[PDB]
Design a protein around this nucleic acid. Structure first.
Ligand SMILES: [Mg+2]
Ligand SMILES: [Mg+2]
Ligand SMILES: [Mg+2]
Ligand SMILES: [Mg+2]
Ligand SMILES: [Mg+2]
Ligand SMILES: [Mg+2]
Ligand SMILES: [Mg+2]
Ligand SMILES: [Mg+2]
Ligand SMILES: [Mg+2]
Ligand SMILES: [Mg+2]
Ligand SMILES: [Mg+2]
Ligand SMILES: [Mg+2]
Ligand SMILES: [Mg+2]
Ligand SMILES: [Mg+2]
Ligand SMILES: [Mg+2]
Ligand SMILES: [Mg+2]
Ligand SMILES: [Mg+2]
Ligand SMILES: [Mg+2]
Ligand SMILES: [Mg+2]
Ligand SMILES: [Mg+2]
Ligand SMILES: [Mg+2]
Ligand SMILES: [Mg+2]
Lengths: 48, 185, 121, 260, 118, 243, 96, 134
RNA sequence: AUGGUAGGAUAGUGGCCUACCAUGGUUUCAACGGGUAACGGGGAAUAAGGGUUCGAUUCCGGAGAGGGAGCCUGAGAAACGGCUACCACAUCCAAGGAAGGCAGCAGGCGCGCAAAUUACCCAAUCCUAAUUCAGGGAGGUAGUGACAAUAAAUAACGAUA
RNA sequence: AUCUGGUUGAUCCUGCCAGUAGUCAUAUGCUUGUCUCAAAGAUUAAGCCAUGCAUGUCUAAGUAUAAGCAAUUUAUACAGUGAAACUGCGAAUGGCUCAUUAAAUCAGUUAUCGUUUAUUUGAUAGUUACAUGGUAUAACUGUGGUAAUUCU
C-alpha cells in the first residue's frame, strides 16, 4: 500500500518469466503440448 | 535553429486487432525463430511492405527504360547481398513473391543456431546479447543483424569472450577462487 | 454580511474570562494562542451526524457505547456514538449496528454541538 | 529585414557547396566581391571542405594571415571572399596552383595547374559600352572593367586576360562550332560544340550544344562560356573531360575499377 | 541640482529637447536628443550655487584666489604652436625648445617629451 | 480579462508585504532525529540576514520575520514534539505546512505516517516538502539524486499535487522555496476560512471582577472576520463570550 | 477544470435503474455549470464539497423510454489526485 | 599478451602550417585504451620530432575493444607547436598554463559596471570621498 | 472614386498630392460587405486511385516590439535592448522631481487540460570591428524532460528422478 | 483496395449510432531498467514583469606627457605596451512572436529603356607659407550642486 522508504536499490507463488522466455512458455503451451479438449482449442479449462 | 534530425517509424501495426489465424501465425513464428515481441514481426512486415511497394510501382511501367533496370537491379543486388533472395531467382517478379520467413531466418539470432554455435535458438539469443560471438572482428550484442554472405564465413566466438579464449568470466574465476581458498584452508 | 472587521487587520480583542483558568495559559512566543470564532447557535447543542471511515491497519474493535473523542473543527468532545449504515430510507429509519463495519463507510450520529461548515471529523 | 542581411543559415546555403548539415547552425556567407553570391565559393570551403588543409574556422584564417593564399595574383585575407569561377588560386608554400572549374555533377572541382597555365585566366565579356571621355571598356564576368579593347569585340565573347598587367591577350569570336563550357543552371558541367544559336526577340536566347558523344542539349545564353575552337581548348579541362554520363553507365564505369 | 542654461530667460524651470553641440547634455547615441529639464539664466532665490569669474582685480587680495597659482598641465604639441608659444622664426627648430616633464620612480629619474605633430 | 485581473489583484492585495501581510509557516519534521531550527537556518541563509537569527537563537519559538528580498511579512510557528494535538493546532491554522524529511533515517510508520494522515484528513493548504540530511549521505551527488528520487516517490504517495522534493543544501533551490513561500497564493480550507480566526502574538489580562476579568489579545484577523455578538472557541479552554 | 457544487441523486428508471452518484461541477474558465459523473466509487467518499476537480468527456447515449438524462462529463482528477489511484488505494488525497 | 601497434593513416604533408596530419589507428589487444601521453611520445621518434611538438586528439575506441581511432598531428619544430595549436591542447600538454580568469557572469557584470562610469573615475572617487567625508 | 493635362514631392514611375477638366472604374465568370479561433509558402498526417484535414514552430518571404502617431543620425530605421508627445499600466521620491517597456536568454505572477535551469563556455558553426588576439544568452555544452523516434535486459544450459 | 454488433415473431433493405486502425497531435492516468536521438509557455493573456545578462570594437599602419607600467639599452620631438577619451565603424544583422492582413502577404514567373545602392572587386583625376596654414574641445587638473538618473 504505502511503500517503506528503504526503496534504495543502489547502496507466495513462484515468479513468472518475462520477455522472450514468456514467448517460449506460450509456444510450448499452445503448440508443443496441444491440449485436445472435446475436438476444440479450449484455452483456460476448468474441472472437466 | 539547426537541421532537424529526421526520424521515421519502422513497425506498422495490423489493421484488425484480434483474429485467431494471424495471432497463431505470429506466435508460431515468434516461438520458432526465437523472437521476444510481435514488434520484430511487425518491423519485418513493414520492410516487406516497403520492398513490395517499390516492386509494384516499378512493375507497372514499360520495360527497357533505364529507370527500371537501374532501380530494379540495384534493389535485387542489395537483396542478394543479404541472401534473402536466392541466386537462381534473379527476376523482379520473384522479389514480389517473397515472404516474412525469408527475411527472418537471416538474423544472427538464427544463424548462430544453424551454424552450430548454440544449442537452442534462445541459447543463440543469449550468446549474442552477452557479448560472446563476433562477426569477424566486431563484437555484437544484437540479434537482428541481417547477416551478409561474405560475413557468414567469419562468425565465431569473440577473442574477449571466454568461449573464444582468454581468461574465464567472473563466475568461473570466482568459483576458482572459492575452491582455491578451500584447498588453501 | 454583518462582519464588523474584515480580515487582514491588526485587532485588539477582549474576552470575558474567569480568573481561575489563568494558570493554564502559556507564553504566546513559546506556545501558540489560536483564536477561533464560532457561528450563531454553535454553542447550542443538538442531535447531529458524522460520517465514519476506519483508518488503515486498524483492526481493533469499537462498539457503540464507549467514550471516543471527536476532533471536528477545533473543539474536541468525548462521545459514545451510535453506529449505523447510511442507506437512504423513505421514513428515515436506519439499522443500529453494535460495532463498526470493517468494510465500508459507516455513519455515526450523536448528541453534539452543531457545526455549520461541514468540517471533517 | 531593414538593411542588408549579414548571416547565412546552413539549410539555405547553395547545395553545390556541399556543406554538412549537422556540424553547426550557420553557413559561411560570402562577402561582396567579384562573383554572384549563389554561384561563388569563399576561401573557407575551398581550404577546409575540399582540400582538408585546415580543421576549424580559425585554422583556415590562420592560413589567411600568413599571405599564402593568392587569388588572381594578389593576396586576399578575407575568409569569405567569393573566389568564384575561372580564377586561379595560388598556394606558394605547396608551390602549386588551383583552378576553379566545375565538375560533371554540378559542383566545383579541384584541378592541378602548372606554373605556365596559371599565368592567364579567360573571361566572358558581359557588356561593352563607351565610358567617360569616349573610351570603350569591357566588363568581363568577374567584375573587371578592362579599358581599351580590340574594336572587334562584342558581347558574350571570351577574352584571355594576362594576370600581371590586367590586359587583354586574345579573344574568341562567338560563332557556331566552338567549344563551349556551360556556366550554370540544371544542366551544369558539360562541354561541347555549338550546333546553332537560336535567336529570340525580347526574351531569352537559347543555344543547341552537341558534345563529343553527340548528345544535343539546350541552355540559355546566360549560362554559356566560350573555351575555344574544335579540340584545342585554351584551358585544361577537368577529369571526366566535360561529358556527363547516364547513371546506369556511370555505375558501369564504377564497377569497372575493381580488380584488387 | 539642475544647471542654468545660457540663453533661456525666465526665473523658472523649462524642459527642453537638448541636442548634440550644446551644454547640459551629452548624446549617448549618435544624433541623440532627450527632453531634459533645465533652469533659466535669470538669477532668483532658488540657486544653491552661483558661479562667478573675475574680470577686474580689486584692491584687497584673496587667499585661495590671488595668492595661489596653478601652472598649466600640458605644453603645446603642434610645431607652429611651439613656434607661436616661444616666438620662434621659421628657420628655428622646434626640437630643442619642447617642454619636458620629469617623472620620478624609485631611484631612476626619467623625463618625458610630447610627440610633436605637423 | 479586465475584471479577472481586477479580482485576481483584489485577491492578491491581502498580502501587501509592507504593513498588511501575515503568512503562517509551520515546519514539522517527520523523524525524531531532526531539529527544525536547522531547517529555519538553511532556509534563511539565502535571505542573508544574520541578526534575525542572532535574535532567534536564545529563547524564542514564535518569530515575526520581515524580508526585504521579496517584501513580505512572515510568521513562523514551531511545534512541540511532545504533543500530537499541539502539532494539529499548528498546522490547522497555518497557510503553509512544511514537512521536514530525513535522508538518513526512514520516516516512522508509528509516528510520522500518522502525522501525514492526520494532517491530511484535518485539511492542508499549500504545502512544501523538503530535505535536510542530503549532505549526511555520501558526498558524490549521483548517490544523492537517487535518495532525492526516493523522497520524491515517498512524498508523491501522499501529496500528488506536488512532484519535487526540494533541497536546502542548494542555494538556488533555497531561493526557489523562499520565493514560493513568499509569493504563491495558498489554497483556502473551507471550514476555517468561513468562521475567521486570529493568531495571537501578545496576551494580557485586565481585572474586572475578582472571579472573572478581561483577556487582551493582539493579533491579525484572518478569514471571514469577527463580530462582537458571536461566540469564540479557544482550543484546550472551550467557548467564551466577547466583551 | 472545475469546482464542485452539489450532490445529484438522480433516479433514472428504464431499462436499468442507475443510482446516479454524480456531482454538479462549476467550471473555472467560463463560469457555466455542467453535471459530471464520478466513476468507479461505490460510495463517492472522495469528491467532497468545494473540492476542485478536472472534468473530461464522456459519450453516454441517454434514453427516451426511461427519461434517463444526458450527462456528458466524467471526473478524472479530484483535488489534484487521480480517481483511479484512489480507487486502487495507491495514493492519497488531501481533503481540502 | 599486449602489443601496442600504432599505424598512421592517410598522411598528408601540409607545408602551409609546417605540419603533417594523419589519422591514428591503434590495435591494442587486452588493453584498455592507449594514453595520449604514451601515444604522443610513441609518435615522437617515429616521426623524428620532439615530444612537445606533436599532438593527438579525438580518440573514439571502437565497439568491442582492442581498437581505437583518433587523429594525429606532427609539427616540424616546437615553435610551430606553440604558434599554431589551439590554446586548450597546449593547456592539456603542460606547454601552456590555464589563465585563472573569473566566470562569464561577473565578467559581464564588471563590463556593465565599468560602462556605468564616464572618464577615468577617480575624480568621482575623490568626489564621493569628500561627500561621505561631509 | 476611373481617366486626361500641368505642377509639386520622392531616391524614383504613379491620383501619391494639389489645381483645371471630362464621368467614368468593378460586378451573378460572385464585385461590394461580413466572418476566419487566417501569417503565406516549402511541408505534415491519412489514403489502391481520386482526395480529406492541418501547417503558431528548426528554411524562405512578411508584420510587430503595450496601442497609435511623429522624427534626428546613417548608405540602409518611421528603429523601439534610439528619442518625442498622447492613451493605458507602473517604479523611486527627502514631494520639488526622475527613470520604464523581457513577442531576446534564464526566471516570476496571472492564465489555462497544456509546456524546463535566474548553470557552463566561445572550444566548434559563423557574424561584427580599427579587425589573429576583443565581443557574441547568435550559437555550443550540461541539467529538467515516457512530446515523439531507433536498437533491446528481465534469463540460458545441462544432469537426476 | 477487408468491415462488424444494434430496429423485427422471423427475413431482406434504407439509415445512422457504436466498435476498429493511424496521427512525427495534444492533455491526462498507471508504470518505468538500458543505448543513441530529440520536441519543450504556439493554442488562453501580442497580459503584467523583480533582478542579472544579451553590442561593442585597436592593427607595424588616425590621435598618448595616464603626474600608469617597465627600465632599457642608440634614441632631448616621439618611438615598448597601454586604462581613459576624441575620431572611424557597427549597433538597420542575429534572436523572438504571429496580433493585424483574404488580390493583402505569399508561391512560381517577369520588368527597371522607372530608381537609390555604406562595403567588396576592377578601372578612374598633369588644367584648382607648400620644407606642409588656422581654431575649438574631450580625456586630464581644480572648484561645485541634488535624496535620486549611464545628471552634469
Ligand atoms: Mg531579423
Ligand atoms: Mg535554372
Ligand atoms: Mg507629371
Ligand atoms: Mg483635385
Ligand atoms: Mg490570427
Ligand atoms: Mg507557418
Ligand atoms: Mg494563434
Ligand atoms: Mg518557440
Ligand atoms: Mg519592423
Ligand atoms: Mg507584454
Ligand atoms: Mg553605421
Ligand atoms: Mg516604433
Ligand atoms: Mg531590435
Ligand atoms: Mg526588451
Ligand atoms: Mg523570455
Ligand atoms: Mg537560444
Ligand atoms: Mg569571441
Ligand atoms: Mg518516447
Ligand atoms: Mg462510429
Ligand atoms: Mg501566449
Ligand atoms: Mg602599438
Ligand atoms: Mg574601390
Amino acid at each position: 500500500m504505502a511503500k517503506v522508504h528503504g526503496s534504495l536499490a543502489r547502496a507466495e507463488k513462484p515468479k513468472k518469466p518475462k520477455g522472450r522466455a514468456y514467448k517460449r512458455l506460450l509456444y510450448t503451451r499452445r503448440f508443443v503440448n496441444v491440449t485436445l479438449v472435446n475436438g476444440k482449442r479450449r484455452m483456460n479449462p476448468g474441472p472437466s | 535553429p539547426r537541421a532537424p534530425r529526421t526520424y521515421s517509424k519502422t513497425y506498422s501495426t495490423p489493421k484488425r486487432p484480434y483474429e485467431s489465424s494471424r495471432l497463431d501465425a505470429e506466435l508460431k513464428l515468434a516461438g520458432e525463430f526465437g523472437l521476444k515481441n510481435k514488434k520484430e514481426i511487425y518491423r519485418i512486415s513493414f520492410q516487406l511492405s516497403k520492398i513490395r511497394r517499390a516492386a509494384r510501382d516499378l512493375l507497372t511501367r514499360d520495360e527497357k527504360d533505364p529507370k527500371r533496370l537501374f532501380e530494379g537491379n540495384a534493389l535485387i543486388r542489395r537483396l542478394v547481398r543479404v541472401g534473402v533472395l536466392s541466386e537462381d531467382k534473379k527476376k523482379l517478379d520473384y522479389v514480389l513473391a517473397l515472404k516474412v520467413e525469408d527475411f527472418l531466418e537471416r538474423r544472427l539470432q538464427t544463424q548462430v543456431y544453424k551454424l552450430g554455435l548454440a544449442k537452442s535458438v534462445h541459447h543463440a539469443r543469449v550468446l549474442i546479447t552477452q557479448r560472446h560471438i563476433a562477426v569477424g572482428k566486431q563484437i555484437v550484442n544484437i540479434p537482428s543483424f541481417m547477416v551478409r554472405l561474405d560475413s557468414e564465413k567469419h562468425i565465431d566466438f569473440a577473442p574477449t569472450s571466454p568461449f573464444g579464449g582468454a581468461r574465464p568470466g567472473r563466475v568461473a574465476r570466482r568459483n576458482a577462487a572459492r575452491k582455491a581458498e578451500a584447498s588453501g584452508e | 454580511n454583518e462582519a464588523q472587521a474584515i480580515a487582514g487587520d491588526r485587532i485588539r480583542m477582549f474576552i470575558r474570562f474567569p480568573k481561575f483558568l489563568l494558570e493554564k495559559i502559556q507564553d504566546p512566543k513559546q506556545l501558540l494562542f489560536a483564536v477561533y470564532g464560532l457561528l450563531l447557535h454553535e454553542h447550542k447543542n443538538a442531535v447531529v451526524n458524522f460520517s465514519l471511515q476506519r483508518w488503515e491497519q486498524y483492526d481493533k474493535p469499537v462498539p457503540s457505547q464507549e467514550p471516543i473523542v471527536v476532533q471536528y473543527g477545533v473543539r474536541r468532545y468525548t462521545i459514545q456514538p451510535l453506529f449505523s449504515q447510511g442507506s437512504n430510507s423513505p421514513n428515515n429509519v436506519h439499522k443500529y449496528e453494535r460495532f463498526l463495519h470493517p468494510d465500508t463507510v459507516s455513519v455515526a450520529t450523536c448528541i453534539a454541538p452543531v457545526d455549520f461548515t461541514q468540517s471533517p471529523a | 529585414a531593414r538593411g542588408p542581411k549579414k548571416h547565412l543559415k546552413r539549410l539555405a546555403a547553395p547545395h553545390h557547396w556541399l556543406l554538412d548539415k549537422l556540424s553547426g547552425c550557420y553557413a559561411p556567407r560570402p562577402s561582396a566581391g567579384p562573383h554572384k553570391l549563389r554561384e561563388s565559393l569563399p576561401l573557407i570551403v575551398f581550404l577546409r571542405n575540399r582540400l582538408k588543409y585546415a580543421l576549424n574556422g580559425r585554422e583556415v584564417k590562420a592560413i589567411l594571415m600568413q599571405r599564402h593564399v593568392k587569388v588572381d595574383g594578389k593576396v586576399r585575407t578575407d575568409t569569405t571572399y567569393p573566389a568564384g569561377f575561372m580564377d586561379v588560386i595560388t598556394l606558394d608554400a605547396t608551390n602549386e596552383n588551383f583552378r576553379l572549374v566545375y565538375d560533371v555533377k554540378g559542383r566545383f572541382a579541384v584541378h592541378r595547374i602548372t606554373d605556365e597555365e596559371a599565368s592567364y585566366k579567360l573571361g566572358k565579356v558581359k557588356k561593352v559600352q563607351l565610358g567617360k571621355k569616349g573610351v570603350p571598356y569591357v566588363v568581363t564576368h568577374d567584375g573587371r572593367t578592362i579599358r581599351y579593347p580590340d574594336p572587334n569585340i562584342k558581347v558574350n565573347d571570351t577574352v584571355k586576360i594576362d594576370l600581371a598587367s590586367g590586359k587583354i591577350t586574345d579573344f574568341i569570336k562567338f560563332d557556331a562550332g566552338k567549344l563551349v563550357y556551360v556556366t550554370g543552371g540544371r544542366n551544369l558541367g558539360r562541354i561541347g560544340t555549338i550546333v546553332h544559336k537560336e535567336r529570340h526577340d525580347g526574351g531569352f536566347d537559347l543555344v543547341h550544344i552537341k558534345d563529343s558523344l553527340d548528345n544535343t542539349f539546350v541552355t540559355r545564353l546566360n549560362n554559356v562560356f566560350v573555351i575555344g575552337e574544335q579540340g584545342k581548348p585554351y584551358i585544361s579541362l577537368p577529369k571526366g573531360k566535360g561529358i556527363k554520363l547516364s547513371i546506369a553507365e556511370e555505375r558501369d564505369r564504377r564497377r569497372a575499377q575493381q580488380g584488387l | 541640482g539642475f544647471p542654468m542654461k545660457q540663453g533661456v530667460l525666465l526665473p523658472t524651470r523649462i524642459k527642453l529637447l537638448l541636442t548634440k553641440n550644446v551644454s547640459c547634455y551629452r548624446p549617448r547615441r549618435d544624433g541623440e536628443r532627450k527632453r531634459k529639464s533645465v533652469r533659466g539664466a535669470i538669477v532668483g532665490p532658488d540657486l544653491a550655487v552661483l558661479a562667478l569669474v573675475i574680470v577686474k582685480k580689486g584692491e584687497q587680495e584673496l587667499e585661495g584666489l590671488t595668492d595661489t597659482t596653478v601652472p598649466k598641465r600640458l605644453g603645446p604639441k603642434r610645431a607652429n604652436n611651439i613656434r607661436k608659444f616661444f616666438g620662434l622664426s621659421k628657420e628655428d627648430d622646434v626640437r630643442d625648445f619642447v617642454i619636458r616633464r620629469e617623472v620620478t620612480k624609485g631611484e631612476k629619474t626619467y623625463t618625458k617629451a610630447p610627440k610633436i605633430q605637423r | 480579462r479586465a475584471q479577472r485581473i481586477l479580482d485576481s489583484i483584489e485577491n492578491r492585495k491581502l498580502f501587501e508585504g509592507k504593513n498588511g501581510a501575515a503568512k503562517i509557516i509551520t515546519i514539522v519534521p517527520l523523524v525524531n532525529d531532526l531539529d527544525p531550527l536547522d531547517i529555519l537556518y538553511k532556509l534563511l541563509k539565502c535571505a542573508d540576514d544574520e541578526g534575525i537569527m542572532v535574535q532567534e537563537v536564545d529563547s524564542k519559538r514564535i518569530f515575526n520575520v520581515h524580508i526585504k528580498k521579496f517584501k513580505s511579512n512572515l510568521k513562523i510557528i514551531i511545534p512541540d514534539m511532545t504533543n500530537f494535538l499541539n502539532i494539529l493546532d499548528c498546522a490547522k491554522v497555518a497557510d503553509f505546512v512544511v514537512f521536514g524529511l530525513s535522508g538518513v533515517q526512514e520516516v516512522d510508520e508509528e509516528f510520522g505516517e500518522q502525522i501525514i494522515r492526520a494532517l491530511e484528513l484535518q485539511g492542508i493548504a499549500s504545502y512544501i516538502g523538503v530535505i535536510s540530511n542530503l549532505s549526511a549521505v555520501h558526498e558524490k551527488e549521483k548517490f544523492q539524486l537517487d535518495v532525492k528520487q526516493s523522497l520524491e516517490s515517498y512524498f508523491k504517495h501522499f501529496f500528488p499535487s506536488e512532484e519535487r522534493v526540494y533541497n536546502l543544501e542548494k542555494n538556488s533551490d533555497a531561493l526557489n522555496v523562499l520565493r514560493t513561500l513568499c509569493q504563491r497564493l495558498p489554497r483556502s480550507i473551507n471550514w476555517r476560512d468561513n468562521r475567521g480566526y486570529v493568531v495571537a502574538d501578545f496576551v494580557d489580562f485586565v481585572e474586572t471582577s475578582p472571579d472573572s476579568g478581561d483577556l487582551v489579545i493582539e493579533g491579525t484577523v484572518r478569514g471571514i472576520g469577527f463580530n462582537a455578538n458571536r461566540l469564540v472557541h479557544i482550543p484546550d479552554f472551550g467557548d467564551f463570550q466577547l466583551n | 477544470k472545475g469546482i464542485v457544487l452539489e450532490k445529484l441523486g438522480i433516479e433514472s428508471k428504464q431499462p436499468n435503474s442507475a443510482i446516479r452518484k454524480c456531482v454538479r461541477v462549476q467550471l473555472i474558465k467560463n463560469g457555466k455549470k455542467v453535471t459530471a459523473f464520478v466513476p468507479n466509487d461505490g460510495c463517492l467518499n472522495f469528491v467532497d464539497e468545494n473540492d476542485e476537480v478536472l472534468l473530461a468527456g464522456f459519450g453516454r447515449k441517454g434514453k427516451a423510454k426511461g427519461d434517463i438524462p444526458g450527462v456528458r462529463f466524467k471526473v478524472v482528477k479530484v483535488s489534484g489526485v487521480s480517481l483511479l489511484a484512489l480507487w486502487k488505494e495507491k495514493k492519497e488525497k488531501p481533503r481540502s | 599478451s599486449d602489443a601496442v601497434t600504432i599505424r598512421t593513416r592517410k598522411v598528408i604533408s601540409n607545408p602551409l602550417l609546417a605540419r603533417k596530419q594523419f589519422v591514428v589507428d591503434v590495435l591494442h589487444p587486452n588493453r584498455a585504451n592507449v594514453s595520449k601521453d604514451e601515444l604522443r611520445e610513441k609518435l615522437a621518434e617515429v616521426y623524428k620530432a620532439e615530444k612537445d611538438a606533436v599532438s593527438v586528439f579525438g580518440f573514439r575506441t571502437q565497439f568491442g575493444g582492442g581498437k581505437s581511432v583518433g587523429f594525429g598531428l606532427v609539427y616540424n619544430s616546437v615553435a610551430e607547436a606553440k604558434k599554431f595549436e589551439p590554446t586548450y591542447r597546449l593547456v592539456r600538454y603542460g606547454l601552456a598554463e590555464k589563465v585563472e580568469k573569473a566566470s562569464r557572469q561577473q565578467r559581464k557584470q564588471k563590463k556593465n559596471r565599468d560602462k556605468k562610469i564616464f572618464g577615468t573615475g577617480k575624480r568621482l572617487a575623490k568626489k564621493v570621498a569628500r561627500r561621505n567625508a561631509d
